[PDB]
Design a binder for this molecule. Structure first.
Ligand SMILES: [Cl-]
Length: 532
């Protein structure tokens, strides 16, 4: 059999139908995301006893910045909206009551700050130097009178006092946005409006509220006057407290490595997370039950190279050994600080995940590339929890499976009827089916090389690959041999010469990495007539 691209002609989470009708919402959003559009989708409760926890879990697993997810109740009023911003890249879920909580905290933030404004107005104006005001207001903040810390960050405290106009604008952008979001929960769910606002919450079009720390974002690059007033010492402290946690966990790993030399090998050759955890708990109970805190023990054994983590966090703390260099941006000091912090916040794997609790989520704004936006939606589709049932149905309608059942899958991203993933292919292979990928286009995606990476993902997992065009095949083979879809990023001399000719040897081109594999040995040319 075969899966056609264009020549074409279930299922849903229990209690629901899809939005749009009869789709896999995570699959059908990929063409528009591939063209850089934010697209909402999700599931609908057909009844009123209907429990949303099944759909909500599919929404959590498949949301990305370009693919916000909604649950709609039976009356077609908005039940919950899930988003993911581009800084922390975490599912964020709103029902109407959690939106109210956010509006309320933004309100008590404003009154509790106005209160401290007056309070300090007398003594504050006795201080002439801005810096002395700062050192003073910073002392007050730490003294935490009337629990002001409950309602504002130190940066918010400082700004509201010393740059009150700027602070009031910043504050209003956040509150207006969440007022706007409240509206969307009354009446019928408005799809295109939910989309344009999501862009205003995720950071694609704007970022006015840091979900991670639930506070107002301060931009180390573009908040230029505030740069000298930014809490560099706090940040530097949290990084040092993170580094301390990382040393505890790493010394737990030493203890385990000592008492159970084989188990680090064993634990790290175990595929699934749920199986890794079972083994971690067995090691804990065998010889550390009375020694360590169990939840800390688990974090330590779950972490992926704490050495590398300790290193990356130390690297940022080192940039904080000189505040004035950062204020000055001493040869990229600040560019590098911002870049490395953004990388750390966006790491959702422990130890980073738990360490980043100590840190704010936002440091400077950034544009989401088409490539990254696509890849986050693509990964969400690879995670989709209903995708397994879909593939099962196809496999059922193929049984019996001889020891020579074949499946030919036609690929022309992103415009085919079904969106195939490497997991899909693997499931077929587990069912006894060999999978051939027929590639309709490759070189033509040179302006959107994330679709070329997607194609390598499938060609790598497939049993075999056919091309209609020799230039497609040889360029793909070259990318699978040198490790990047853009020859200008490779060691290949004509590639380097092309870089130098077009952007200069040193320019920092966008990367399209491809894990190297033997494309040549598993592919060939065919002719369309053989498919017809
Ligand atoms: Cl190409």
């Amino acid at each position: 059999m075969s899966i056609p691209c264009k020549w074409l002609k279930i299922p849903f989470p229990t209690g629901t139908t899809s939005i749009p009708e009869e789709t896999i919402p995570s699959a059908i959003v990929l063409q528009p995301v591939a063209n850089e559009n934010t697209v909402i989708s999700g599931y609908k409760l057909k009844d009123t006893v209907s429990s949303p926890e099944k759909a909500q879990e599919v929404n959590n697993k498949t949301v990305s910045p370009r693919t916000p997810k909604i649950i709609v109740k039976h009356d077609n009023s908005l039940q919950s909206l899930t988003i993911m911003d581009i800084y922390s890249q975490k599912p964020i879920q709103f029902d109407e009551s959690k939106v109210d909580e956010i509006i309320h905290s933004l309100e008590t933030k404003k009154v509790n700050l106005e209160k401290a404004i007056e309070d300090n107005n007398a003594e504050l104006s006795k201080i002439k130097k801005q810096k002395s005001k700062l050192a003073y207001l910073t002392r007050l903040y730490k003294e935490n009178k009337e629990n002001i810390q409950d309602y504002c960050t130190l940066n918010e405290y400082i700004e509201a006092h010393l740059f009150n106009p700027k602070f009031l604008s910043r504050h209003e952008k956040a509150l207006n946005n969440f007022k706007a979001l409240k509206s969307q929960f009354t009446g019928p769910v408005n799809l295109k409006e939910l989309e344009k606002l999501t862009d205003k919450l995720t950071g694609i079009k704007e970022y006015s509220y840091d979900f991670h720390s639930n506070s107002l974002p301060y931009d180390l690059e573009h908040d230029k006057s505030f740069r000298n007033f930014y809490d560099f010492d706090g940040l530097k402290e949290s990084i040092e407290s993170i580094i301390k946690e990382l040393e505890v966990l790493n010394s737990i790993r030493q203890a385990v490595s000592d008492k159970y030399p084989n188990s680090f090998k064993a634990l790290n050759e175990t595929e699934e997370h749920d199986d890794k955890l079972k083994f971690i708990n067995i090691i804990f109970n065998d010889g550390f039950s009375t020694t360590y805190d169990q939840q800390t023990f688990i974090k330590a054994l779950s972490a992926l190279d704490i050495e590398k983590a300790i290193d990356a966090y130390t690297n940022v703390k080192n940039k904080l050994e000189n505040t004035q260099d950062i204020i000055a941006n001493k040869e990229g000091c600040r560019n590098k600080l911002i870049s490395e912090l953004q990388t750390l916040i966006a790491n959702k794997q422990e130890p980073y995940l738990s360490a980043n609790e100590k840190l704010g989520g936002f440091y400077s704004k950034r544009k989401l590339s088409a490539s990254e936006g696509f890849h986050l939606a693509y990964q969400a589709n690879r995670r989709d929890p209903i995708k397994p049932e879909v593939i099962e149905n196809i496999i059922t309608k193929m049984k019996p499976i001889d020891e020579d059942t074949h499946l030919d899958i036609h690929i022309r991203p992103p415009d085919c009827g079904v969106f195939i993933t490497p997991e899909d292919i693997k499931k077929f292979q587990e069912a006894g089916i060999k999978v051939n990928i027929t590639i309709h286009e490759y070189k033509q995606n040179y302006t959107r090389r994330y679709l070329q990476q997607y194609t390598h993902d499938l060609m790598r997992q497939a049993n075999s690959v056919q091309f209609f065009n020799a230039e497609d095949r040889e360029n793909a083979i070259i990318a699978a041999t040198y490790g990047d879809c853009d020859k200008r990023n490779t060691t290949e001399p004509t590639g380097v010469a092309k870089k130098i000719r077009e952007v200069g040897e040193d320019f920092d081109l966008d990367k399209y990495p491809v894990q190297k594999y033997d494309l040549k040995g598993k592919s060939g040319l065919t002719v369309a007539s053989q498919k017809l």
